[PDB]
């Protein structure tokens, strides 16, 4: 054999190669004299068909094609959190430093993590020579960042008996931290492990998901809750705010780490995250710190080679599963899923595999399914018991804003949360543009067991919110044909409170100090006051309409105009300056003001 | 350094099929290299090798394949990809869709031979665009602000004056030196004269460059026509630190050149038969807008596209919609009422506006004024849609005030002369004189402090 074959032909991202006998499908191979990274996608004899994760312009017939025996894989270890990686896991900070140029050179050989930086390693202190150790066992802690402790773990395939463990100190990626013996064979390990991106990191069990994923946004938190470990999609037309939700989860959520994956996304977006996230700060133990210290960015912008989008998604989930095995509540923003389906389309077009719908390959449903099913809460591998999760949030982007698109259709067959973004709300600058009739959350039953521990009133309020919106949407089918004239007073109350809920609860101005994030207490408080107004206003009319002294919806509006203004004002409360106690007290004043005004109408 | 090895020339055409000539016996074909073709009649042509396999090379010909001959055609392989000769001296000049001069000047004496494709800008090095450009037009500078280094297209219905708006931006845009690059794909002769004449009348010739592919020119040149503009913009911006506004006229005629090539190659279709890769091809154009680290330069793009049958869900506007930082949109609902520039604010947005709006860049209120103008104009459209069914008798007094706001708004905010220049500050004073139509308590998007300072003025 030859360790390398030779390029037989090229067509966009696809390269065919001769003398590739003895190559595995999904083996990583380097193509061209410049070593363009690619992966074998079909075998045809001694010929292999390769998918190249870099632009193939300039590849020549007879250029070298070096085999590696290894699939596309991530170096997992210290130096991930706060870094940014391209779609094939090369760190862009080092690329800038080594190249001094505004461009990513094709065929860059940079290591996925810095091998020269020294890291503080604390061994687990329970391990000794002769201790039995298994995949996912934690052999130490690295102080990677002030927020994130990197619990280095035995690779999931590995098993053995501890033969050497390094003492406490400072070490690098080449320093052997652990050595094992098993079955008469030795293994040497550093603080870095290599894992195949297409392979799921195994777990002890996939656990039930029963804790809310708290987010920046009122309607997501309250009306369509996500769960930690849940699968979510955000199907939405262009300009609808799919990206504002994705950063709202990233900037402001209860997740322990965030993996942000700019798959096929405009380049200014990854720059926006890289600029804004080091300035934005969360707080731990009364110490303020940059949210970049808990974030990891996978970049693969809209103008980078389409094949690297598949590599980007699988890289981003591989990273996310690693932090999950460290016992963290991981969150993954998949900033575009149809951009991945387009990469699968273009490659399948060069392979001439028959298309299913809209030109997408028939395996798209399995590609998306096997991606989203890597989400979950899990009991982690290896000695110390941990529980962690990956939540996956897929920003599906259907062409023409039509949810019948096959990427959306296949996604909604899998995911358990649907935040459908409506272009008609986005046009009116109603953001978040989530359509509350279209959207669903399937995790609500699993979360009611949590809501009862902290907010017994919440399930009543969520139910009444949907009733108000449903009655208004049904009344609107009459109003559109007859105008605002024929409605009953109860119907006008329903219409106007649904508009209050739309304008002042469902809308949230994510670019302002008061609406940048909305803690859950403000969420239940605002909704409680608006539904309290609804119940009291309804009771007032329904009690008095039986007699000459009938209360009207106009009489309520006119006599209680200051209350309607106060209810609308509730968004402007600043979570940093108005303390939780002060917000609850102000909202209790609104409750009493309503009660006194309705008692004056009675 | 330079390729010293002598070029091969082949007569070994083994087929011709639509726009593709299939060479054979080719020694080590290089994918995407350029080929110079000489026809039997001595006519010179150019092409790019869009597939390779062993001894074969499938060259697509830019000038089309009429008169290619399977025995006499000579194909000189250059051994390298399509490079644009670039230099500072490309300012003050006009080139065709393949970068050949048409101003009767000489060839471009190059300072470098940049790749037509450029390279992906490193996301680590991409500086965020936030410094505000004033275009001079209130419907842009007020509700759809443009950053230095943004890409933001004008979407138009067919026959609308989008050319006049793009001219007005090149005529009056500036900061709160802007060189210009202009490309056009499938442009009609009268419109080519319009843009060329506008730059000559405005006198800004020594700092503009034009690439013109007319509707009678070969369609395949349209693939490289915007890439030439961008490759010149990358030289001027990133190597010479200039700021550039890059205009891409008729991205629909570009996309039709892709639809033609796609259909002629049997490529996998997306919606309306555009190629499945259309998003990435458009991204390789659009994403070259931006600032970059340690260079004072910036490429800003204003693409222009006429939507087929005015359908916003059409693949051309729709994929552009996903890639660019929001949209400027022009509408028959304004144009038919003589409301120049006919910029409908509701379908319009700017993704980079939020970062550009704020203190020092603009008046501190600007973000809030925008937010409330959108709300009032949106309600105004919805109450108009109601009134058309039911008359004023089923509208409230407040709904009739939003209908009156819509009339006052279009006549003062959007309506603006083809040489009338307005700063953002005058636009915001106009915005407040419109917002004052409602009582203070109705302005539900604006914080109480902003209202208390500005509402009574």
């Amino acid at each position: 054999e030859s360790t390398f074959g030779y390029v037989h032909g090229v067509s966009g991202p696809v390269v065919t190669a001769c003398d590739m006998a003895g190559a595995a499908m999904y083996e990583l191979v380097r193509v061209g004299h410049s070593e363009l990274v690619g992966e074998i996608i079909r075998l045809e004899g001694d010929m292999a068909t390769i998918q190249v994760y870099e632009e193939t312009s300039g590849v020549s017939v007879g250029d070298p094609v070096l085999r590696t025996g290894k699939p596309l894989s991530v170096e997992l270890g210290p130096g991930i959190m706060g870094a940014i990686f391209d779609g094939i896991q090369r760190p862009l900070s080092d690329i800038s430093s080594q190249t001094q140029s505004i461009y990513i050179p094709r065929g860059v050989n940079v290591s996925a993590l810095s091998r020269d930086i020294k890291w503080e390693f604390i061994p687990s202190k329970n391990l000794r020579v002769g201790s039995h150790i298994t995949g996912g066992d934690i052999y130490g802690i690295v102080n990677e960042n002030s927020l994130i402790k990197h619990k280095i773990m035995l690779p999931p395939r590995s098993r053995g008996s501890v033969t050497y463990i390094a003492p406490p100190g400072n070490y690098d990626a080449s320093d052997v931290v652990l050595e094992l013996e098993f079955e008469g064979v030795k293994e040497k390990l550093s603080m870095v492990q290599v894992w195949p991106v297409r392979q799921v990191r195994p777990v002890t069990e996939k656990l039930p998901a029963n804790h809310p994923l708290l987010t920046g946004q009122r309607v997501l938190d309250a009306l369509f809750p996500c769960v930690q470990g849940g699968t979510t999609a955000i199907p939405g037309a262009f300009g609808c705010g799919k990206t504002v939700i994705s950063q709202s989860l990233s900037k402001y959520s209860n997740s322990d780490v965030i993996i942000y994956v700019g798959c096929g996304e405009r380049g200014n977006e990854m720059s926006e995250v890289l600029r804004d996230f080091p300035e934005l700060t969360m707080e731990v133990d009364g110490k303020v710190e940059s949210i970049m210290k808990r974030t990891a960015l996978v970049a693969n912008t809209s103008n980078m080679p389409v094949a690297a989008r598949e590599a980007s998604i699988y890289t981003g989930i591989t990273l996310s599963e690693y932090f999950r095995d460290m016992g963290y509540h991981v969150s993954m923003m998949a900033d575009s899923t149809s951009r991945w389906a387009e990469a699968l389309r273009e490659i399948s077009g060069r392979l001439a595999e028959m298309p299913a719908d809209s030109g997408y390959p028939a395996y798209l449903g399995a590609r998306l399914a096997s991606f989203y099913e890597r989400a979950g809460r899990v009991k982690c591998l290896g000695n110390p018991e941990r529980e962690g999760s990956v939540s996956i949030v897929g920003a599906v982007s259907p062409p023409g804003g039509d949810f019948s698109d096959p990427v959306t259709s296949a996604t909604l067959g899998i995911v358990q949360v649907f935040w459908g973004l409506d272009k008609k709300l986005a046009q009116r600058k109603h953001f978040p543009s989530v359509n509350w009739l279209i959207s669903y959350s399937k995790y609500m039953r699993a979360l009611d067991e949590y809501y009862d521990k902290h907010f017994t009133e919440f399930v009543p309020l969520r139910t009444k919110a949907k009733e108000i919106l449903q009655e208004e949407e049904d009344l609107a089918e009459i109003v559109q044909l007859v105008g605002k004239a024929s409605l009953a007073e109860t119907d006008k109350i329903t219409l106007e409170v649904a508009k209050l809920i739309k304008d002042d609860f469902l809308q949230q101005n994510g670019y302002t100090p008061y609406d940048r994030f909305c803690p859950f207490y403000k969420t239940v408080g605002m909704l409680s006051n608006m539904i309290s107004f609804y119940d009291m206003a309804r009771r007032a009319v329904e009690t008095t309409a039986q007699s000459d002294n009938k209360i009207t919806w106009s009489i309520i509006r006119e006599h209680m105009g200051e209350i309607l203004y106060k209810l609308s004002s509730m968004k402007f409360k600043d979570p940093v300056k108005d303390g939780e106690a002060k917000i609850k007290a102000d909202y209790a004043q609104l409750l009493e003001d309503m009660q006194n005004a309705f008692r004056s109408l009675e | 350094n330079y390729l010293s090895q002598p070029r091969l020339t082949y007569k070994t055409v083994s087929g011709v099929n639509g726009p593709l000539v299939i060479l054979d016996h080719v020694k080590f074909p290089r994918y995407a290299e350029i080929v110079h073709l000489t026809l039997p009649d001595g006519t010179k042509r150019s092409g790019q090798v869009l597939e390779v396999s062993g001894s074969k090379a499938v060259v697509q010909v830019f000038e089309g394949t009429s008169g290619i001959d399977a025995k006499k055609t000579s194909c000189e392989f250059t051994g390298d990809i399509l490079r644009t000769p670039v230099s500072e001296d490309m300012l003050g000049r006009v080139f065709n869709g393949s970068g050949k001069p048409i101003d009767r000047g000489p060839v471009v004496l190059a300072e470098d031979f940049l790749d037509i494709m450029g390279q992906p800008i490193n996301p680590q090095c991409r500086i965020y665009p936030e410094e505000m450009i004033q275009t001079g037009i209130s419907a842009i500078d007020g509700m759809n602000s443009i950053a230095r280094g943004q890409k933001i297209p004008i979407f138009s219905a067919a026959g609308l004056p989008h050319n006049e708006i793009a001219a007005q931006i090149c005529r009056q845009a500036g900061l709160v030196n802007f060189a210009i690059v202009f490309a056009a794909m499938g442009v009609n002769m009268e419109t080519a004269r319009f843009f060329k004449s506008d730059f000559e009348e405005n006198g800004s010739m020594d700092n503009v460059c034009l690439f013109l592919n007319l509707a009678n020119d070969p369609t395949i040149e349209r693939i490289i026509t915007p890439r030439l503009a961008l490759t010149t913009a990358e030289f001027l911006a990133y190597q010479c630190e200039k700021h550039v506004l890059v205009i891409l006229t008729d991205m629909s005629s570009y996309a039709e050149a892709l639809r033609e090539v796609s259909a002629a190659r049997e490529e996998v279709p997306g919606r309306r038969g555009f190629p499945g890769y259309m998003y990435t091809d458009l991204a390789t154009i659009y994403e070259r807008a931006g600032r970059v680290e340690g260079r004072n330069g910036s490429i800003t793009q204003i693409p222009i596209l006429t939507m087929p049958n005015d359908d916003i869900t059409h693949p051309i506007p729709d994929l552009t919609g996903y890639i660019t930082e929001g949209q400027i949109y022009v509408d028959r609902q304004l144009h038919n009422r003589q409301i120049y520039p006919p910029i409908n604010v509701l379908p319009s947005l700017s993704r980079l506006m939020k970062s550009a709006i704020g203190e020092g860049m603009t008046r501190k209120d600007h973000a809030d004024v925008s937010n409330q103008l959108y709300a009032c104009y949106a309600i105004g459209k919805d109450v108009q849609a109601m009134k058309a069914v039911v008359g004023e008798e089923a509208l409230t007094s407040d709904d009739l005030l939003y209908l009156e706001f819509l009339q006052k708004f279009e006549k003062n905010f959007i309506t603006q002369g083809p040489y009338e220049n307005r700063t953002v500050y005058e636009t915001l004073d106009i915005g407040w004189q419109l917002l004052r139509i409602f009582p203070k308590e109705m302005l539900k998007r604006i914080p109480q402090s902003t209202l208390s300072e500005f509402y009574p003025r």
Partner: peptide
């Protein structure tokens, strides 16, 4: 149309290969 054009192309290739294998 696209699916059927690809089917017809595959048949054309299989016809040609079947003739070439008899030479």
């Amino acid at each position: 149309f696209y699916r059927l054009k690809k089917i017809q192309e595959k048949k054309k290739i299989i016809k040609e290969k079947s003739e070439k294998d008899l030479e």
